[PDB]
Amino acid sequence: SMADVLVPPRKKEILDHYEERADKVEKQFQRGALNHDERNEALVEIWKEATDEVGQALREHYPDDNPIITIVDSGATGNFTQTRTLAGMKGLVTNPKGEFIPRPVKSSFREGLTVLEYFINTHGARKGLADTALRTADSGYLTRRLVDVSQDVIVREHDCQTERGIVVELAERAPDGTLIRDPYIETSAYARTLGTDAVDEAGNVIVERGQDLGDPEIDALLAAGITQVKVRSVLTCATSTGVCATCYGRSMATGKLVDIGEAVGIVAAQSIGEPGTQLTTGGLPRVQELFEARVPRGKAPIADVTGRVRLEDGERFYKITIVPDDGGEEVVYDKISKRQRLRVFKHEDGSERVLSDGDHVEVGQQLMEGSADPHEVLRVQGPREVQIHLVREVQEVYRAQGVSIHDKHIEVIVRQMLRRVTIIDSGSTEFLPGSLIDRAEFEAENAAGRPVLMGITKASLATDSWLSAASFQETTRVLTDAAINCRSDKLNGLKENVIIGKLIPAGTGINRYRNIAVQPTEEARAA
Amino acid sequence: LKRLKVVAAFQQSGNSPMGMVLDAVPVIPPELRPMVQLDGGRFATSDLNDLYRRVINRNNRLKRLIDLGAPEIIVNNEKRMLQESVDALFDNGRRGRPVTGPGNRPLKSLSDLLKGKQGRFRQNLLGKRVDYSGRSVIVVGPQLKLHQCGLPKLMALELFKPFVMKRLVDLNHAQNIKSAKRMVERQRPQVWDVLEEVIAEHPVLLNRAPTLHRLGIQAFEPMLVEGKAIQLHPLVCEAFNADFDGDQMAVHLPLSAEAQAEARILMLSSNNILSPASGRPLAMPRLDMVTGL
Amino acid sequence: RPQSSSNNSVPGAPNRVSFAKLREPLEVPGLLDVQTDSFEWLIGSPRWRESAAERGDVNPVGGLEEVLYELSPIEDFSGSMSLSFSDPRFDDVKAPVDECKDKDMTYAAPLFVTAEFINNNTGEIKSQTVFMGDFPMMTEKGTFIINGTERVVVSQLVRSPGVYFDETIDKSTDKTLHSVKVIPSRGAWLEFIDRKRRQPVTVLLGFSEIMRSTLEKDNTVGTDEALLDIYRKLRPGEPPTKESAQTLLENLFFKEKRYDLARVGRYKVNKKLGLTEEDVVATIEYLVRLHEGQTTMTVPGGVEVPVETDDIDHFGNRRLRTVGELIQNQIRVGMSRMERVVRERMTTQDVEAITPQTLINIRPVVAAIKEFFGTSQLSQFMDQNNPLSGLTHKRRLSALGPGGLSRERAGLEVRDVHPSHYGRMCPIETPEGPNIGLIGSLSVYARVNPFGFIETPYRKVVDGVVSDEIVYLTADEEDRHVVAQANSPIDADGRFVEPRVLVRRKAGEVEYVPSSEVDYMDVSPRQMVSVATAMIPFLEHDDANRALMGANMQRQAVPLVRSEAPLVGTGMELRAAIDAGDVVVAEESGVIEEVSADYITVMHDNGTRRTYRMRKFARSNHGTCANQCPIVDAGDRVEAGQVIADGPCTDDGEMALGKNLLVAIMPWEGHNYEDAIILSNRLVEEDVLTSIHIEEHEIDARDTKLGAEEITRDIPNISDEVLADLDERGIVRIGAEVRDGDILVGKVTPKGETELTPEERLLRAIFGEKAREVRDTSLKVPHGESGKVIGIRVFSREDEDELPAGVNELVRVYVAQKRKISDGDKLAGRHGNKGVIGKILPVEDMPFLADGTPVDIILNTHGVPRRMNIGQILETHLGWCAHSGWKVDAAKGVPDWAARLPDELLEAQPNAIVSTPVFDGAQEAELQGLLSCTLPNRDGDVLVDADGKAMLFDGRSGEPFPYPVTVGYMYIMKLHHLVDDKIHARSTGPYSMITQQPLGGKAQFGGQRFGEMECWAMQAYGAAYTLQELLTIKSDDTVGRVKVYEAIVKGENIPEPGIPESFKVLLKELQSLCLNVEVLSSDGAAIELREGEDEDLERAAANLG
Amino acid sequence: LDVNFFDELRIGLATAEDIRQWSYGEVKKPETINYRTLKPEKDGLFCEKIFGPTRDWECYCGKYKRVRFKGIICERCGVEVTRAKVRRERMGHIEL
Ligand SMILES: [Zn+2]
Ligand SMILES: [Zn+2]
């Protein structure tokens, strides 16, 4: 009801007060003592503060049994920003270019907007609708490339019995005796198979390896004071093609251990792409930047080796040299712009500070603030590090938007990124130099090769199936190369089998479930 | 190295490089490039017929020029036109300005059939139009159980039509199966009991586009419902992202015992409560339900 | 009538009292003027002649006159003769509008011109009247009839010709570099040539220092080197002559036939610089002054020229090509081709016997007009769901089409609202889909320039005193003066009451300035909104997205069998309906002489008579029912402009798109869950949401391979019972009730003897039957269709009826359906609130007021607050007031909340129609006050309290709902998304001859598309047999589908799937690409894919015995 | 008639020998169908002598229309009497 929409009693006085502050900023700009960008910056801070204050007074005046309050505070629907826009004020509205306009909308849609306020609001509304219309298309494209890279990954066996895994933080020890729970427990620890037994320093193993790590297991682990747990994941899985059920762990839908026939690559692609329309490099293009293994914009270098750092100070850009402690030659970086801030971190002496002159740096420590290049992390820190890095960064983007995706889904894609190596030296074998060969063929045919990180698209086009590669992208090129090379498609995969009308090699289509003898027992035939 | 990849490719594969130059051009069967007359006497051909036709005319004029002993400049012009027309036949616009039809529209070449989202790879292979399927607007189903969906009577009668005919000939309502078809098509009153019978415990698949995750398709037990709208259970909306603003959904009828078993077991609505991504409950209450509780 | 009543200027208008507190200085112009004024300009009509005399240039030139003056000096290479044109003249119309719609003709009038030939050798002068072809004419409604179908030419948004400057920040050093472009009307564009990259700035020849270092890259010697480099750089063709290619290159910057100076463009570059080559030089000087920032530009003779960047999305740089200019351009093309034919016919012919008739060939002109109205993306099928959709369609401003920009090339920067759109293009109304920002609508008061720029009226202020003088300003002119909002206190003598008024800054910012420094003021608060947007009550209380949806859905409302004007309007309804044209208006004052459902005739005071024929149950383009009814009686006196007859969606002259429904905002038993809407069965029983929908079924009898088809009543294997409703020709009879599968028009097609079944051939050979074998091709009613036959139209070759080649007989059957509101139909309010009916309850189930009145509609509470449309609540409150009437208490004097109310709103009778204009509407406090003084019902009970809430009983249990529920009256429209059209189902049906997949679409009885993402879903479930079954035996497996139907009909198991036809088609395409693709078995041999022919023959032969 | 035992799918360049082996004849004419008779012209893109008959068991000239003649090649018009289905599996060729 119009009566059920309550208006803040002090709204006029609040807005007048902050309008007096804004008038002071106006006089500051009139004297020439304020920059135009600084004028707009000060005004934007003023009206942000005012919108906050009318929001607070608004929530203060509303009884908690009011229907507009009840609907939001029960979690049923809506948020208080909408309530504040309705009853209190609309606030600052965006430019066509995306900037905040220095004059806020002081009206609330209960009062009704004036002509100019409404006209200004149309900018943000319009650009919002358009941005949704493009975002759905881009998210659909990323989902399609995730599907194409991951769709042949299925669970081919129960257990590969590997002892490899990753360390996952269950908590952090505060200065107080209290235990600060890790924010990532939901998407990292929970729903994993235990890699090694977690033992409290005071006694018996609380959770045995090969356990689901549910909420009871997490509560018993935390009550026992276990700050870390090593879990099995598909990143460390030893199965050549696909993954073992035990490394992938629990199926999120069923709550039990993932079934054999399950195709977890398509579930992973859909699980990553379905929220993608909520993502607003900081956004979804950062997710694409990570999955495509592109050298990031605003690249931050890392230390190639442990040693001392000589920091050169200059106006235009930073220049960094490093003298290694092993006795080797100095690794000299360069071309670090002054717009890039220095990395704040824990040094080896145990202090939390910014990178300064003459510090000591360990292997792989990030020198500059920004997004590190996963290709360099692969060379310096090894293959098992870039998996953790990529999963963590993608998870950073998806968590910053409030979307909950479990790590294993990202680990299927990331696992598909590392599957191959580069041949630098042919040696005795027939591999050509610079070529990208699968890790299984490279080790069985074995001579010199290095792990390679590939984008999901590049890794997709490199599949052994020309029929599958032709249906993804660059059909003409794929068919020309396949024709000249006289390629023979083995016709094993769920995209190839769909095309020719054959049962997909997953779920009910695998040979274990497909061919089965079913006959009644003698006791049942008797009755 | 880059030259070695292609030269070695032709060396090891047994491909004769002469295959890159053609003395004979294949012609696709006419059913794949049909010609249909429209209302108004006009005819409509696939672009392929115009491309093939240009190659034919220019080739025959080249033959006439060879016989006539024409100047080498004219014969050469005709040879260039022939090469360019075969180019337009295989991949149109890959070199030069594309061959256009009326309205200055570039014709679709043989390469265009294999490429893009509208080509024969994406939408003629990975997906197709299917029988035993329908669609309609969805309305809220609040009286439904989680494993059930309301099916409009006429929709169910069309979807299950063969089953209703068979069960209609089993009883004596229909003398034979042809008269059974005539009765189902005329919606004779005898078909509603039999329809309700064959519907029982026969699952159907519901889908709302776009399908973002596998929960975008779910299996339900249909029940005959009044009206022309599909009644959807309020707890699966979150999974389908189903708002009732006029959203529509599609129904598919599994036929074989394997398809029905997969629907009842794998895809059943009440068998997937939880997000396949986060494991959190989806079929959980929201909106009015939350408010009530 | 008082000032409070809206639409005081329209005679006989209903009395709708307005809450507006501001006087309207200027009335809304003709909402079709954007069409009619442009076309009258093209024709050179007397009306446009008068308007151009008053407000236009002293020398008027029409569009046709302009093309002829451009084309008049046609001279051959010798120059011994010339053919001139002049004086366009039009005959009367070939056939009237209704005859053109009925006969599938084109509404047109013959065009004639005066052609004069001069012979310089013998001095003869031959003047001849030449027929230039039938010229399609614009109706009074602003449309065209092309092949019997009504069409709208949408105005196109394009860039004006001129010179546009921009600065680009390079990736290297982030330096500032200014890139310039020159857009001609016709000819090749220039940059700082015609797609030729690497073009040197030096090859063409602080400020002179950067130009001087620019000149150091290449030395220049004489008039040779630069012109040779331009010659060889222009085209790769072998250089013929350096000098002659230099002069032929000089033809590109000079000749008006090649490089066409844009009249509008010349005005733009002149208004930019100075009052040719001097323009080019001044452009180099402008760029040089742009390299180093300058607020003044200098050139020879130039002065007072600012240096600035140019925003290409601004409405000073972005103009409209209206219908007249588009037609004029296609005419220019046709006339140019005809001129090539004329010059070609001049050089070779006998100069003594030539005539203008001989030289002129009108085929390319008529073919140009035909190709335009036929094939152009700007010539559009007129959208008539209701009058508002067609009206807004005629005011549509489109950025697409030839000469515009493509959908893919459109970025987010062209779509969003520009500050120069204020009062010109409505920021609210744009398509919600991929076309957002590419399609606008003209604002209510906006007007198109003779140059194509959109103006807006403004109130001129002299020394802080607001005057009544109106001035129309282009966005260019608007970016100089300071303009004030229409809401601001004013003295009774025209003075500004407040010391200072708020204003829009030139840059598109907001400022506060004293009244003496303010130039112009907005004429209306609705100045910026379009017509549909201005019909949304409490628009200011709704967020821009939801208001967009409301504006768009009003255009989707379907005409109901009976129209009811809204209790709560904005006042735009009347002028919207009148200007839309679908209402019948009296052209001259007089008395009604006679009135029938068929026609009204009015006797003028002159003794003259005028009779208006009513459109009765006419089918619109989209199938809605256009039905006019007279609102006048026999003795009535009417005035010029008064509405004689209501049309579709009109009540007493006002647009009525829906019904006033008693609404209750509350959750009800999950049936309104998630935007779903609950309705009372009364709306079905009393037909308040019922609409008529008319479908046109067409079938023809043509020549086939085996000979002519026949339309006949004699259909083999068909009972006399089902032929009952057919006439002696086999055509259904007027008034027949037809249902799903019924025969409309009987037709038979010749069949071959190889197509008979073996049993059919046994009968034919045994009884010696007729040699003619036919198949039953009769036109049948599609699935899910019912109605009565309201009309039949038949065309035959035996008469003079023009038919396409091969077509002997053509018959059309019109079927009218009465559609009652149903579960699945879509409803919406004007605020963007919308949903589908999820339940239609018995009247006794609905919540009812204490007096027993059941509510009509239940809207879910959870839907309202987060969509940010609170107007729907406000309207609801106001609705109830208007429903019940009110008496404000003046006994002790006017309360302070009613102080600003006009004296006419202090009381209202029950069911009072009321106007709440946008931005001027009913204020919160006034609405709250009206809620208190509401009149009681017939028993003296006040049903709705001061909050707008009532106590409701649950119609099911009987208990009262424990808390008061908001109730009132809301205006609800029935949208054109209707479950009767949407429901479709197929077990088995026709398949494509090409892909052998099921056909698509409901009209084709098609199957559902199971796409790539749905296959991803199937694979994620791991369902292999469902996926395979869908993509094989359910789609393109040709043997699998038939065997599956056999298996189901016989109660057997479904067989194993075969091979999809799609894979075979893929292989055939690969082979057609010269790719040798073989399917290898396990042993390495190539499998060959075919099918055995003997199986069908073995079963078919064993069938008989 | 065949379940899919397909082990693999091979693709390579087609020589003129392959194209001529695929072909059921050479298309020598630009004509499509006759405007009066709606019959495919001979040696055209729709020609029945090469791509197969348009109507089941009917040769182009009309001397043989019936199932008794199945498999024979008409000595007049050269059209095989068979199912028109073959019209989607039968390729022509053009001699350059
Ligand atoms: Zn494993
Ligand atoms: Zn023959």
Q: How far apart are CA B242 and CA B234, in angstroms?
A: 9
**Cα dihedral D78, D83, D86, D88 in deg (nearest 10):** 120
Q: How far apart are CA C530 and CA C423, in angstroms?
A: 9
Residue type, B212: L
With CB atoms and an 8 Å threshold, state whether C985 touches B155: yes
| Nearest ligand, measured from the Cα of D60 | 2
Q: How far apart are CA A28 and CA A31, in angstroms?
A: 5
Asked whether B234 and B283 are in contact (CB, 8 A), the reply is: no
Domain containing residue A57: CATH number: 1.10.132.30
Which residues are within 5 Å of ligand 1 (an ion), measured at CB? Answer: A 160, 237, 244, 247
DSSP SS3 for C803: coil
Interchain contact B14–A (C-beta under 8 A): yes
Interchain contact C131–B (C-beta under 8 A): no
Q: How far apart are CA C786 and CA C793, in angstroms?
A: 20
Which two tokens mark C630?
């007279």
Q: Which residues contact A190 (CB under 8 A, 6 or more apart)?
A: A213, A214, A215, A218, A406
Rg of the Cα trace of chain B?
29
Q: How far apart are CA C237 and CA D4, in angstroms?
A: 58
Query: What does this entry list as its resolution, in Å?
Result: 2.8
Q: How far apart are CA B109 and CA B46, in angstroms?
A: 10
Chains interfacing with B (3 or more CB pairs < 8 Å)? A, C, D
Asked whether A155 and A243 are in contact (CB, 8 A), the reply is: yes
C109 closest CA partner among C31, C42, C33, C37: C42
C454 closest CA partner among C505, C483, C415, C420: C420
| Nearest ligand, measured from the Cα of D42 | 2
Cα–Cα–Cα angle for A134, A137, A138, rounded to 5 degrees: 85
Interchain contact D79–C (C-beta under 8 A): no
Asked whether C612 and C599 are in contact (CB, 8 A), the reply is: yes
- Bridge partners (DSSP) listed for residue C125: C118
Q: Which residues contact C715 (CB under 8 A, 6 or more apart)?
A: C723, C730, C743, C746, C748, C776, C778
The DSSP-derived string for B139-177 is EE-TTS-TTEEEEEHHHHHHHTHHHHHHHHHHSSSSSSH
| Residue B245: CB atoms within 10 Å | 18
For A81, the domain range is 2-130
DSSP SS3 for D92: strand
Terminal C-alpha separation, chain A: 70
Asked whether A338 and A332 are in contact (CB, 8 A), the reply is: no
The β-bridge relationship of strands B217-225 and B148-152 is parallel
A237 is in an annotated binding site: yes
Q: How far apart are CA A205 and CA A208, in angstroms?
A: 7
Q: Which residues contact C463 (CB under 8 A, 6 or more apart)?
A: C516
Asked whether C727 and C713 are in contact (CB, 8 A), the reply is: yes
Cis peptide preceding B210, ω within 30 of 0: yes
Domain containing residue C181: CATH number: 3.90.1110.10
B13 closest CA partner among C81, D10, A78: D10
With CB atoms and an 8 Å threshold, state whether B29 touches D51: yes
Taken in order A8, A10, A12, A16, the sign of the CA dihedral is negative
Place of tokens 């229909």: B174
The side-by-side arrangement of strands in the sheet containing A448-451 is A436-438, A420-425, A448-451
Residue type, B253: L
Helix, strand, coil abundance in chain A, percent, nearest 5:
40, 15, 45
Which two tokens mark C421?
């759109």
DSSP SS3 for C157: strand
Interchain contact C1057–A (C-beta under 8 A): yes
Interface A–D counts its CB contacts (< 8 A) at 33
Place of tokens 């990030």: A366
Q: How far apart are CA C573 and CA C561, in angstroms?
A: 19
Q: Outline where DSSP puts E strands in C5-57.
A: 17-18
Chain D residue numbers touching A479 (CB-CB < 8 A): 11
Q: How far is the alpha carbon of D16 from chain B, nearest alpha carbon, in Å?
A: 6
Which two tokens mark B15?
């491909």
Exposure string (b/e) for A385-424, b if CB count within 10 Å is 16 or more? Answer: ebbbbbbebbbebbeeeebebbbbbbbbbbbbbbbbbbbe
Cα B235 to chain center, whole Å? Answer: 29
Minimum-distance CB partner of B291 among A74, A251, A476? A74
By CB atoms closer than 10 A (0-12, 13-18, 19+), residue C181 is: middle
Q: How far apart are CA C101 and CA C94, in angstroms?
A: 13
The DSSP-derived string for D21-88 is HH-S-B------B-TTT-PBPTTSTT-HHHH--SSTTB-SSSS-BSGGGTT-B-TTT--B-S-GGGGG
Q: How far apart are CA A246 and CA A238, in angstroms?
A: 11
By CB atoms closer than 10 A (0-12, 13-18, 19+), residue C812 is: middle
Asked whether C512 and C503 are in contact (CB, 8 A), the reply is: yes
Exposure string (b/e) for A235-267, b if CB count within 10 Å is 16 or more? Answer: bbbebeebbbbbbbbbbbbeeebbebbbbbbbb
Q: How far apart are CA C160 and CA B165, in angstroms?
A: 68
Minimum-distance CB partner of C1076 among D8, D11, D67? D11
Which two tokens mark C723?
């032929």
CA separation, residue B77 to residues B58, B70, B86 (Å): 10, 11, 14
**Cα dihedral A312, A315, A316, A320 in deg (nearest 10):** 10
A188 closest CA partner among A165, A160, A164: A165
Which two tokens mark A455?
């984008």
Cα–Cα–Cα angle for C230, C236, C241, rounded to 5 degrees: 60
Alpha-helical regions (H) of A456-493: 456-461, 466-470, 475-484
Which two tokens mark C1053?
């198991």
Asked whether A388 and A169 are in contact (CB, 8 A), the reply is: no
**Cα dihedral B161, B165, B168, B169 in deg (nearest 10):** -170
Asked whether B29 and B49 are in contact (CB, 8 A), the reply is: no
Portion 806-845 of C in contact with B at CB < 8 A: 806-807, 822-824, 826, 834-839
Q: Which residues contact C717 (CB under 8 A, 6 or more apart)?
A: C776
Q: How far apart are CA C868 and CA B287, in angstroms?
A: 17
Task: For residue A156, report the phi and psi dihedrals to the nearest 5 degrees.
Answer: -95, -10
- Bridge partners (DSSP) listed for residue C678: C839, C858
| Residue C746: CB atoms within 10 Å | 26
Asked whether A439 and A427 are in contact (CB, 8 A), the reply is: no
Q: How far is the alpha carbon of A73 from chain C, nearest alpha carbon, in Å?
A: 13
State the helix-helix crossing angle for B257-265 and C1024-1031, rounded to 10 degrees. Answer: 130
Interchain contact D7–A (C-beta under 8 A): yes
- Bridge partners (DSSP) listed for residue C448: C454
Residue C424 DSSP one-character state? T
Query: In terms of CA atoms, which chain D residue is nearest residue C1058?
Result: D3
B63 closest CA partner among B84, B78, B80, B81: B78
Residue C959 DSSP one-character state? P
Element (DSSP H or E) covering residue C264: helix C263-272
The β-bridge relationship of strands C447-448 and C454-462 is antiparallel
Q: How far apart are CA A323 and CA A356, in angstroms?
A: 15
For C243, the domain range is 159-320
